[PDB]
């Protein structure tokens, strides 16, 4: 019966809420009310990368923390050498409407996707010397919002058809379709161990998925609007999700609830992209107010402002070694901060 | 700088030259968003002047255009329309012949979208001949779906085609007036709506888009000079 199923669902949700409140022994602010503040950190624009014709919508660091891929909504995927501002590669794209790009951990492949409902995997290392389409993964009935490489063969893409998908580049077929979100998934962050990944959707909900055994392990609510960005804490037991409600939140997988809420009364814009520092003490969130904000992840105190972008900040990402942050905005500029 | 470093800088400079050549084309091409409903006539228009997103490159008067039609998507449009905050115009196609209120609401949240405040809308009222040959018959009454039709007179600034009954002109201009009443309200002058009448078989549609894109660009350039 539909009514009894709805009643059972409501009872289960009430039980989940009660269990979550039971574990709320204290707050992260109370536990970390004695640690010294990180201070007023100040990172300046050490390098501005120009050459993108249109608004940059995605950017991903390489494993070596020297190469940087950036996708612009002009049909261009540019791989830069972040140390020397040099452009290592300029890949034309079949579709000029691109919202995501992923750099493989090995550095031999680069992904992109957008309103073409297709994940294009390009082979950087080829005997022919050029970058060519290695694969065109299709099967998503909607725009691809984010993509992340597990390895040289497996990529997981969250697309605006309320689904994520673990693919298989060799066969070009979906290996596991993660369903359960009621709205378009905007971003997904891979756990460092690659066993799990969390994806936030336009339903004010993030969801943890087991990549091997495809299912939603945990669901996290608390946001009042669409989650635009999700990032995984370096430890891998927590993740920060920013929404277009001028709020980021830190959720612990073990506590299964929000730990801290980063927000300010002077902030009315929406978070577009979120990244964590290597230590996890700093949470860098790009907003719609043309500047990013550095938050104390353990105290909910704003620690800095990465002002300098003339348009909305679309993406920001920390290096694997934590050396420098990169920020791509709609002003067609990539800025590196230290 | 070593030899390989210098050669890498040379590769970067060649990439920059190619990017400049590509910019010479990107800045000279005007992007448009083809929006509408399933029973609107978008497919007929894209078939004229000649899954994912579909790109149609139509050039008239020696200026290239790029019309993008969004397909294989869902009702949640707000999260991909942000990608179109820099296009020249949104060609919004409406079937003038039941679901007219649904299409009128669809015109809102596109006119009133916070990412399209400076985005002009070229409004196409497609398949006007269906309305023409449907309104002579009394089977369907426009006043039945829209009550404020009897208490409405045809505008003085109307240019009916030679051979059009007054009822046809009154109905089509009532639909247009509904759309422009939605458009002008909550409009700060940053973007303008340009209504047109089409029958889905008209070689002039590309010319209308041309003449309207030139007007949009003209007003934006004038605004850059603080002349308007």
């Amino acid at each position: 019966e539909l009514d009894q199923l709805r009643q059972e669902a409501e009872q289960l949700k009430n039980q989940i809420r009660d269990a979550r409140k039971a574990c709320a022994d204290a707050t992260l602010s109370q536990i970390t009310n004695n640690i010294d503040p990180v201070g007023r950190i100040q990172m300046r624009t050490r390098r501005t990368l120009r050459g993108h014709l249109a608004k940059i919508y995605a950017m991903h660091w390489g494993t070596d923390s020297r190469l940087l891929v950036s996708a612009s909504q002009d049909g261009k995927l540019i791989i830069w050498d972040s140390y020397t501002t040099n452009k290592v590669h300029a890949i034309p794209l079949r579709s000029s409407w691109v919202m995501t790009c992923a750099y493989a951990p090995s550095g031999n492949y680069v992904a992109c996707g957008g309103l073409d409902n297709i994940c294009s995997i390009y082979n950087l290392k080829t005997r022919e010397g050029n970058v060519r389409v290695s694969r065109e993964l299709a099967g998503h009935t909607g725009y691809l919002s984010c993509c992340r490489f597990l390895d040289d063969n497996q990529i997981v893409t969250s697309s605006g058809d309320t689904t994520c998908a673990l693919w298989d580049i060799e066969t070009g077929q979906q290996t596991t379709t993660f369903t359960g979100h009621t709205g378009d998934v905007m971003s997904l962050s891979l756990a460092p161990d690659t066993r799990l990944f969390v994806s936030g959707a336009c339903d004010a909900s993030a969801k943890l998925w087991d990549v091997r055994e495809g299912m939603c392990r945990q669901t996290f609510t608390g946001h009042e609007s669409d989650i635009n960005a999700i990032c995984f804490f370096p430890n891998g037991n927590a993740f920060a999700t920013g929404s277009d409600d001028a709020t980021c939140r830190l959720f612990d997988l073990r506590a299964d609830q929000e730990l801290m809420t980063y927000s300010h009364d002077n902030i009315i814009c929406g978070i577009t992209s979120v990244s964590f520092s290597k230590s996890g003490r700093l949470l860098l969130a790009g907003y719609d107010d043309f500047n990013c904000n550095v938050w104390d992840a353990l105290k909910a105190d704003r620690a800095g402002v990465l002002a300098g972008h003339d348009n909305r900040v679309s993406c920001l990402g920390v290096t694997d070694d934590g050396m420098a942050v990169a920020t791509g905005s709609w002003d067609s500029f990539l800025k590196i901060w230290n | 700088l070593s030899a390989e470093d210098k050669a890498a800088v040379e590769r970067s400079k060649m990439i920059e030259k190619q990017l400049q050549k590509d910019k010479q084309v990107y800045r000279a091409t005007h992007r448009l968003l083809l929006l509408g409903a399933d029973n609107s006539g978008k497919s007929t228009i894209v078939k004229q002047m000649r899954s994912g997103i579909f790109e149609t490159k139509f050039q008239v008067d020696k200026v290239n255009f790029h019309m993008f039609d969004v397909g294989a998507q869902r009702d949640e449009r707000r999260k991909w329309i942000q990608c179109f905050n820099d296009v020249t115009a949104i060609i919004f196609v409406v079937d003038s012949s039941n679901r007219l209120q649904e299409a009128l609401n669809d015109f809102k949240s596109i006119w009133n979208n916070r990412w399209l405040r400076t985005i002009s809308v070229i409004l196409f009222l497609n398949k006007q001949d269906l309305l023409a040959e449907k309104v002579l018959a009394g089977k369907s009454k426009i006043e039945d779906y829209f009550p404020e039709f009897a208490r409405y007179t045809t505008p003085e600034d109307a240019t009916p085609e030679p051979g059009e009954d007054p009822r046809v002109t009154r109905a089509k201009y009532f639909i247009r007036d509904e759309f422009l009443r939605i458009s002008t309200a909550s409009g700060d002058g940053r973007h303008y709506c340009y209504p047109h009448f089409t029958c889905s078989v008209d070689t002039e549609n590309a010319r209308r888009i041309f003449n309207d894109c030139r007007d949009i660009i003209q007003r934006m350039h004038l605004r850059q000079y603080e002349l308007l």
Partner: single-chain antibody
Amino acid sequence: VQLVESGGGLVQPGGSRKLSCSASGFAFSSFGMHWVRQAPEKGLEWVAYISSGSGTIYYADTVKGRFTISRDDPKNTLFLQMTSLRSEDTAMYYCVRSIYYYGSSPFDFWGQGTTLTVSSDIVMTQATSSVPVTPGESVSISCRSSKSLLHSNGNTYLYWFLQRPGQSPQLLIYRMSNLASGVPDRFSGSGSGTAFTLTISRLEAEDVGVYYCMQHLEYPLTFGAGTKLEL
């Protein structure tokens, strides 16, 4: 991905001849191309370099002015025009492709060569001119430099090439520790400024031949004498 080189033969001294190299299988435009010759029963000598886009053109000090290099990207063919020929210019002229970016593998592919029979610099020293080789054992070829090859970038521009009997040289190691594509994992490279060792573990057949060490820190590119491994 193959480069086939033609336009060579018997030339009277003082003559002029155009050496053509036609490429097929890779992007000619994005690849810089070098001409590197090898005199009979001698080592490897760099002759010329035409960069991607014909921007920087470099010539060896011994062929400067007499030789000119050019490329045709639409025709995918690289030309070496040779004027005022000398008897000290007889060699098998090899054409190599080298692309330059971060993580690139310059000098990755060589061609087949053309016989042209005619009727300061960073000196590379290879002390071992010949080394006995037994299959299954390990060997360590040594190379020395006249100046440190470790730039401020942290890259030690040393290249180890292998030339099998009757075959064109094949890239083995680039930047003094980097295994080239298709090269077995047994090969390794190590060393520091003005000292380099290439170690081959579990030496096998089809591995004998002449090993060459080359510098890429600054032009002109100078190779080594060549260490011969034979069974």
